Write a protein that binds this ligand. Structure first.
Ligand code: HEM
Length: 404
């Protein structure tokens, strides 16, 4: 059944064979499918024999504690299964070194860059939405959710419009390969692309993200072209699949809940709070760490080299962290989640992501206030490191919409 044999140190009462790439209840919705790990008969910390065999922490308190404890729970191997070539920076690095590359990456996506970009972000959203508005329909995932983050990256990185189809193909192969290329081939292709641009902006710098990363200082010396390509790499792929799929869950829910749409139409000042609460409800990342040594964690013996999945998705859904966690309530006094992670790798794009989400909601709801799922359509989710939405066919009446 693809169950790896149970390591001898793992007690049988801790075994719960969850499959993170194919969970049992997927058709109920992917968050609901993962929430099974939080039923009361399910221990706080379990081992699944799926996918090579690995721990899962199922409660927000454990998830946070392990993300904090990078000395036991290392990022050198963050993906399950173990045999899954990933050299992006700073994602596979622990502190101390991680902190250098992080401060550099922060100069390109940090809050003040985000404030600088806000209306470029709005102008992109408006032109995307305006072109769909008179059609009375779209595949949201395909027609807005994908083109939007990749266009934001071209803006940040100072890259030409004409490169978008090829860059999007390459990033698409990394996360949903059609078979043309291996992951390594897509990566090297991506590197082929970025190397000359980095070399040149080392020499004639702009005020764009590649210029900033190329001309950076690590541990007292300049960044190597290799380190630069591997950072620039993460800056591209880190903001695509997450944003594309998050925007999709959020639009799917809004299309299914006219009352929540109405609330934001009538009170657009609530849109930043609604953004936070959507990020809790439709959280969607689950990566992991590797044990640096033997370690007893909450009464459970963990072995050096064990992988442990620490699902960022699960902290906000945990009923010990938020009451009625499946209920969407834009007025939650305390929205608690780890949707952007927790600890030293906390999402560097978190400020860019919130602006992307806020602007999307504000702009869509004012131009196309009333929209629904396409009659007959059943929305299908998918599950993995980044869970998401397969497609989102939306429809509206063009007469009910505003040219702005
Ligand atoms: C809904 C949108 C997003 C979500 C849910 C999300 C989620 C996450 C999570 C959970 C991590 C930490 C992973 C770990 O600890 O192993 C992370 C890291 C990171 N994210 Fe995001 N992210 C989003 C958007 C973005 C965007 C728009 C960018 C900008 C390009 C970005 C850039 C990064 C980078 C560079 C890291 C590495 C931080 C480090 O290792 O120090 N993210 N993100």
């Amino acid at each position: 059944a693809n169950l790896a044999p149970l390591p001898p140190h793992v007690p049988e009462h801790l075994v719960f064979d969850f499959d993170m790439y194919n969970p049992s209840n997927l058709s109920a919705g992917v968050q609901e499918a993962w929430a099974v790990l939080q039923e009361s008969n399910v221990p706080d910390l379990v081992w699944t024999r799926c996918n090579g065999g690995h721990w899962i922490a199922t409660r927000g308190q454990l998830i946070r504690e392990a993300y904090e404890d990078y000395r036991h729970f290392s990022s050198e191997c963050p993906f399950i299964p173990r045999e899954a070539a990933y050299d992006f920076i700073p994602t596979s690095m622990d502190p101390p070194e991680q902190r250098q590359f992080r401060a550099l990456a922060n100069q390109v996506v940090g809050m003040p860059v985000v404030d600088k970009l806000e209306n470029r972000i709005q102008e992109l959203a408006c032109s995307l939405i305006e072109s769909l508005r008179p059609q009375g329909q779209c595949n949201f995932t395909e027609d807005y959710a994908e083109p939007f983050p990749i266009r934001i990256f071209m803006l940040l990185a100072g890259l030409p419009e004409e490169d978008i189809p090829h860059l999007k193909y390459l990033t698409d192969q990394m996360t949903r390969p059609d078979g043309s290329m291996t992951f390594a081939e897509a990566k090297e292709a991506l590197y082929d692309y970025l190397i000359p641009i980095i070399e040149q902006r080392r020499q004639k710098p702009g005020t764009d993200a590649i210029s900033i990363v190329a001309n950076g200082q690590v541990n007292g010396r300049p960044i190597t072209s290799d380190e630069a390509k591997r950072m620039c790499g993460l800056l591209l792929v880190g903001g695509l699949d997450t944003v594309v799929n998050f925007l999709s869950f959020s639009m799917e829910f809004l299309a299914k809940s006219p009352e929540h749409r109405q609330e934001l139409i009538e009170r657009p000042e609530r849109i930043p709070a609604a953004c936070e609460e959507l990020l809790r409800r439709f959280s969607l990342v689950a990566d992991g760490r590797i044990l640096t040594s033997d370690y007893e964690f909450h009464g459970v013996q963990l072995k050096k080299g064990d992988q442990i999945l620490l699902p960022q998705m699960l902290s906000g859904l945990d009923e010990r962290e938020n009451a009625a966690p499946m209920h969407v309530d834009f007025s939650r006094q305390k929205v608690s989640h780890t949707t952007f992670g927790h600890g030293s790798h906390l999402c560097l794009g978190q400020h860019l992501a919130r602006r992307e989400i806020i602007v999307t909601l504000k702009e869509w709801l004012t131009r196309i206030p009333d929209f629904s799922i396409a009659p007959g359509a059943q929305i299908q989710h998918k599950s993995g490191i980044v869970s998401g939405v397969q497609a989102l066919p939306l429809v509206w009446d063009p007469a009910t919409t505003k040219a702005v």
